[PDB]
């Protein structure tokens, strides 16, 4: 498929001791440089990578916006819109 | 089209090996199947990874091993491999395997004389039957009596039947004025020196 | 599971062939594919087609101007049309089912071949011009002068037939355990002198004189002959 | 939108405390994600898009 059996060096629980680990990843996550395929990760170039949030839903829920006191949001529940202009029934 | 192996003998109940070379191989696997003598072909491969006999998915020849089975396995083998664009499957010049063993040619079939209407119609046509032998090379050489006569109508090329036994037999086609007249008739069995044969008589009653 | 082949096994040089094959039984008769096989007289094998219900045109490209594969929706019967090239390699034609066994229903995702798992009877298609001839029914009579249950020599003759397919059945399709049918050469004329013999245990037979069934192929001649009751 | 790629949990610690979680092993046949959509419904929605 589009997965590659990669090997690499990762510093274990102890800083002094180093262990060679094998792990899976999807296509495009790595880019070539050089019998055996020798390449690099796409991150090192561009930015410092961090591991994302565990057991945190990355799926949206209804986020309504509330304007502060002495201000109001004009609601336009009008049928048609021509790419900005005067409305009929401003709420 | 395909580089198929022509003929390879069997090991005495030991290691079995075949090849079949081609350009795809790493593209659309192998697929073998066997053609039984005068019978419909049957299943060999059990492909599922995206019985009994197995192979290694190589780019050179692939190969196939049929275990340590000497007898019970002798047929014409082939290979069906699809092109990258599903064009053709390509097949070579066949694979005719052979099994070692079994005794020398022992034809155990009695003779057959023609009777009733055939004779009184227009032609005699002596059946002269000789079958069930391994291997062939048995000269029928029909005699009018004890002295062999020519006649030379036809002798069928050996065909595989039962337990690898070649039984095609010979068939004569002479006139009744050559059969129900003059000498008795007797066709022989000749393989290597000693071989048993029978006799045919024109009239019994 | 079951496959019955039909059509005339005789074609005049070039012309056309209307080869047929009916699928008798199947649990899943749509998802599985279909293939035709060209068996050489006694040499090798040649691939034909590959037809699927979706209207798949996968075929042998070596003889692309010769291929016309028919697929009937109602019923699982299949037909093959051979245009111009017929006489080049003539022998036998077998019909086999090419299994698919998809893991996922995605047509492009998880499709694979298991191969030609189910094969049929196979009919003989020989091309050498000429017309059909009738099979002459003449018996050979038995050779019995023994005592108990021993050797017997029942013989079915014949003088001629036109195409390679031969249909012979002893006792009208009853005891076929010890039937010894042998092939025969054309004798330069073209008419093969094929003879079928049965080695029965000579015990006590009067009315039970084993009859031979002759069915031919195109003329459909059905003349059963009784072997002369002699002992 | 589905993904019939069935993956296990592999944790490798980078230095002290810190835990890195990556794709373990895929159980079953190799397959694409597989989103899926209707043929006719979309066509019907496109019908008024080309008209507008
Ligand atoms: C918009 O989308 C349409 C179809 O939805 C595309 O039309 C096809 O264009 C391709 C261009 O290469 C033609 O090529 C063939 O594609 C086939 C895919 O299957 C389609 O047709 C089958 C017919 O059974 C349908 O059932 C199925 O739903 C698909 O729509 C391949 O399967 C073909 O290969 C076959 O024959 C080859 C070799 O002869 C064998 O290898 C294979 O086993 C297989 O049996 C082939 O590659 C195709 O003919 C066009 N028509 C159809 C009806 O789909 C449009 O091109 C696309 N728009 C753009 C711009 O790409
Ligand atoms: C890439 O895929 C390979 C698959 O070849 C993964 O490594 C291999 O893992 C197996 C089993 O986990 C090792 O085999 C066995 O080891 C045991 C115990 O050490 C031994 O007793 C057995 O006799 C047998 O040898 C196998 O050796 C190992 N490969 C090597 C060369 O070390 C690998 O982890 C995968 N990782 C990725 C995604 O890159
Ligand atoms: C949404 O749709 C409305 C309705 O068409 C848009 O109104 C149009 O506004 C433009 C200027 O923004 C008008 O153009 C000018 O009209 C005057 C009239 O004298 C003419 O002299 C000028 O030469 C020019 O044509 C236009 O007339 C008007 N609609 C009409 C009646 O044709 C509105 O702006 C739209 N929203 C946007 C900005 O997309
Ligand atoms: C989306 O695909 C469907 C077909 O799968 C297209 O539907 C067909 O659209 C045509 C013409 O726009 C319709 O033709 C009309 O049929 C009526 C029936 O009485 C007839 O009176 C008219 O003279 C005309 O022939 C057709 O009914 C409709 N149905 C079909 C064949 O499925 C649809 O047009 C596509 N989306 C587009 C292009 O907007
Ligand atoms: C992890 O570190 C080990 C240290 O042994 C690497 O093994 C050596 O790899 C280099 C090339 O990358 C070779 O020249 C050496 O000959 C290797 N030694 C052995 C034991 O054969 C290992 O490749 C490293 N893995 C990665 C990719 O980081
Ligand atoms: C636009 O005008 C319509 C009526 O022409 C207003 O529609 C109603 O809004 C109320 C708000 O509570 C609903 O309870 C009614 O059911 C609506 N009527 C229906 C069915 O259209 C609409 O609210 C106006 N626009 C704005 C900006 O709110
Ligand atoms: C990777 O980062 C280096 C650092 O400059 C950059 O030169 C290179 O082009 C990047 N990746 C690409 C485009 O292969």
The domain that contains B70 carries what CATH number? 2.60.40.10
Q: Is C150 exposed, middle or buried (0-12, 13-18, 19+ CB in 10 A)?
A: exposed
* Breaks in chain C, after residue numbers (C to N greater than 2.5 Å): none
C127 touches chain B (CB under 8 A): no
CB atoms near residue C166 (< 10 Å): 19
Closest CA to B112 of B175, B185, B176: B185
Tell me the C-alpha distance between A25 and C132, whole Å.
Answer: 70
- Say whether the peptide bond before residue B33 is cis (omega within 30 degrees of 0): no
User: What tokens does A25 get?
Assistant: 């990843």
- Tell me the β-bridge partners of C38: C46, C93
Q: Could you write out the three-class secondary structure of C122-186?
A: CEEEECCCCCCCCCCCCECCCCCCCCCCECCCEEECCCCCCCCCCCEEECCCCCCCCEEEECCCC
Tell me the C-alpha distance between A80 and D50, whole Å.
Answer: 18
- CA C56–ligand 1 middle distance (angstroms): 9
Tell me the C-alpha distance between A90 and C197, whole Å.
Answer: 104
The radius of gyration of chain D from alpha carbons, rounded to an integer in Å, stands at 21
Asked if C150 and C34 count as a contact pair (C-beta separation under 8 A), the reply is no
Question: Among B101, B130, B155, which residue terminates a domain?
Answer: B101
**Same domain for B95 and B108:** no
Chosen for mutation from C106, C107, C108, C111 (greatest number of chain D CBs closer than 10 Å) is C106
Question: Among B73, B101, B129, which residue terminates a domain?
Answer: B101
Tell me the C-alpha distance between B148 and B152, whole Å.
Answer: 11
Pocket test for ligand 2, best of A5, A8, A26, A39 (most atoms within 8 A of CB): A5
Q: How far is D45 from chain A (nearest CA, A)?
A: 18
The radius of gyration of chain C from alpha carbons, rounded to an integer in Å, stands at 22
Asked if C44 and B91 count as a contact pair (C-beta separation under 8 A), the reply is yes
Is the minimum distance from the CB of A38 to ligand 5 under 6 angstroms? no
Resolution of this model in Å is 4.8
Asked if C54 and C34 count as a contact pair (C-beta separation under 8 A), the reply is no
Pocket test for ligand 3, best of A78, A82, A84, A87 (most atoms within 8 A of CB): A82
Contacts of D36 (CB under 8 A, 6+ apart): D1, D2
**Same domain for B93 and B114:** no
Asked if B66 and B53 count as a contact pair (C-beta separation under 8 A), the reply is yes
**Same domain for B202 and B106:** yes
Q: How far is B46 from chain C (nearest CA, A)?
A: 7
**Same domain for B97 and B5:** yes
Asked if B65 and B53 count as a contact pair (C-beta separation under 8 A), the reply is yes
**Same domain for B106 and B205:** yes
Tell me the C-alpha distance between B97 and C118, whole Å.
Answer: 23
Residues in chain A with CB shorter than 8 Å from the CB of D30 are 1
**Same domain for B113 and B60:** no
**Same domain for B163 and B95:** no
In angstroms, the Cα distances linking A21 to A4, A17, D22 are 14, 13, 12
Nearest neighbour of B159 by CB, restricted to C113, C114, C183: C183
Question: Among B101, B129, B151, which residue terminates a domain?
Answer: B101
**Same domain for B127 and B94:** no
State which residues form the domain around B71.
1-101
Pocket test for ligand 6, best of A73, A77, A88 (most atoms within 8 A of CB): A77
**Same domain for B109 and B88:** no
Residue nearest to atom 21 of ligand 6 (CA): A77
Strand segments (E) across chain A: 6-11, 18-23, 30-32, 39-41
Contacts of B26 (CB under 8 A, 6+ apart): B57, B59
- CA A68–ligand 6 middle distance (angstroms): 24
Give the helix ranges, DSSP H, for A1-91.
Answer: 42-46
Tell me the C-alpha distance between A23 and B174, whole Å.
Answer: 85
Tell me the C-alpha distance between B60 and B58, whole Å.
Answer: 6
User: What tokens does C38 get?
Assistant: 């060209």
With touching defined as 3 or more inter-chain CB pairs under 8 Å, the answer for chains C and A is no
Residues in chain A with CB shorter than 8 Å from the CB of D23 are 23-26
Q: Could you write out the three-class secondary structure of chain B?
A: CCECCCCCECCCCCCCCECCECCCCCCCCCCCCEECCCCCCECCCCCCCCCCCECCCCCCCCCEECCCCCCCCCCEECCCCCCCCCCCCCCCCCEECECCCCCCCCCCCCCCCCCCHHHHHCCCCCCCCCCCECCCCCECCCECCCCECCCCCEECCCCEECCCEECCCEECCCCHHHHCCCCCCECCCECCCCCCCCCCCCCCC
Closest CA to C156 of C180, C190, C186: C180
**Same domain for B97 and B108:** no
Structurally, chain B folds into a number of domains equal to 2
Is the minimum distance from the CB of C57 to ligand 1 under 6 angstroms? yes
Handedness of CA D21, D22, D25, D31 (dihedral sign): positive
Most distant CA pair in chain B, distance: 75
Closest ligand (CA of D38): 4
Q: How far is C50 from chain D (nearest CA, A)?
A: 25
Tell me the C-alpha distance between B84 and B90, whole Å.
Answer: 13
Asked if C110 lies within 8 A of D4 by C-beta distance, the reply is no
**Same domain for B197 and B107:** yes
Q: Is C200 exposed, middle or buried (0-12, 13-18, 19+ CB in 10 A)?
A: buried
In the sheet that holds C78-83, the strands lie side by side as C3-6, C16-23, C78-83, C67-71
Q: How far is D6 from chain C (nearest CA, A)?
A: 14
D34 touches chain A (CB under 8 A): no
**Same domain for B54 and B117:** no
Asked if B28 lies within 8 A of C94 by C-beta distance, the reply is no
3-class secondary-structure state, position C58: coil
Q: How many residues does the structure list for chain C?
A: 231
In angstroms, the Cα distances linking A8 to A21, A23, A39, A40, A52 are 6, 9, 11, 10, 21
Asked if B47 lies within 8 A of C159 by C-beta distance, the reply is no
Q: Which chains touch B (3 or more CB pairs under 8 A)?
A: C
């Amino acid at each position: 498929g589009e997965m590659k059996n990669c090997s690499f060096n990762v510093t274990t629980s102890i800083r002094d001791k180093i262990k060679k680990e094998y792990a899976l990843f999807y296509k495009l996550d790595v880019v070539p440089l050089e019998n055996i395929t020798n390449y690099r990760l796409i991150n090192c170039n561009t930015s410092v990578i961090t591991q994302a949030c565990p057991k945190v839903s990355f799926e949206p829920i209804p986020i309504h916006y509330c304007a502060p006191a002495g201000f109001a949001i004009l609601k336009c529940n009008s049928k048609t819109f021509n790419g900005s202009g005067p409305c009929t029934n401003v709420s | 089209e395909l580089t198929q192996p022509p003929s390879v003998s069997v090991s005495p109940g030991q290691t079995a090996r075949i090849t079949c070379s081609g350009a795809p191989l790493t593209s659309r696997f192998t697929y073998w199947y066997r053609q039984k003598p005068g019978q419909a072909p049957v299943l060999i491969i059990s492909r599922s990874s995206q019985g009994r006999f197995s192979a290694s998915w190589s780019g050179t020849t692939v190969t196939l091993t049929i275990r340590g089975v000497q007898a019970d396995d002798e047929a014409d083998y082939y290979c069906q491999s699809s092109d990258t664009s599903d064009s053709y499957k390509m097949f070579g010049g066949g694979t005719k395997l052979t099994v070692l063993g079994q005794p020398a040619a022992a034809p155990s079939v009695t003779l057959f004389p023609p009777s009733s209407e055939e004779l009184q119609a227009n032609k005699a046509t002596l059946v002269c039957l000789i079958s069930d032998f391994y291997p062939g090379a048995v000269t029928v050489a029909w005699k009018a009596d004890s002295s062999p006569v020519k006649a030379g109508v036809e002798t069928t090329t050996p065909s595989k039947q039962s337990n690898n036994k070649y039984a095609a037999s010979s068939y004569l086609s002479l006139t009744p004025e050559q059969w129900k007249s003059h000498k008795s008739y007797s066709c022989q069995v000749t393989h290597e020196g000693s071989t048993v044969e029978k006799t045919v008589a024109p009239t019994e009653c | 599971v079951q496959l019955r082949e039909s059509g005339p096994g005789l074609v005049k040089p070039s012309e056309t062939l209307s080869l047929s094959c009916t699928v008798s039984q199947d649990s899943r008769p749509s998802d599985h594919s279909w293939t035709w096989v060209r068996q050489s007289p006694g040499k090798a094998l040649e691939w034909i087609g590959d037809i699927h219900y979706n209207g798949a045109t996968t075929y042998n490209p070596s003889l692309r101007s010769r291929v016309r594969i028919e697929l009937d929706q109602s019923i699982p019967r299949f037909s093959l049309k051979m245009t111009s090239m017929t006489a080049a390699d003539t022998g036998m034609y077998y019909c086999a089912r090419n299994a698919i066994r998809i893991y996922g229903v995605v047509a492009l995702g998880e499709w694979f071949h298991y191969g030609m798992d189910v094969w049929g009877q196979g009919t003989a298609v020989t091309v050498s011009s000429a017309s059909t001839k009738g099979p002459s029914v003449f018996p050979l009579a038995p050779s019995s002068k023994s005592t108990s249950g021993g050797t017997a020599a029942l013989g079915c003759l014949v003088k001629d037939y036109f195409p390679e397919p031969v249909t012979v059945s002893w006792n009208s399709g009853a005891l076929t355990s010890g039937v010894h049918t042998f092939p025969a050469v054309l004798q330069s004329s073209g008419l093969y002198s094929l003879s079928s013999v049965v080695t029965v245990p000579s015990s006590s037979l009067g009315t039970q004189t084993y009859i031979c069934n002759v069915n031919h192929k195109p003329s459909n001649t059905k003349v059963d002959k009784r072997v002369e009751p002699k002992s | 939108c589905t993904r019939p790629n069935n993956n296990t949990r592999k944790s490798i610690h980078i230095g002290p405390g810190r835990a890195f979680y990556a794709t373990g092993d895929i159980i079953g046949n190799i397959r694409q994600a597989h989103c899926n959509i209707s043929k006719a419904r979309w066509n019907e929605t496109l019908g008024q898009i080309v008209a507008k």
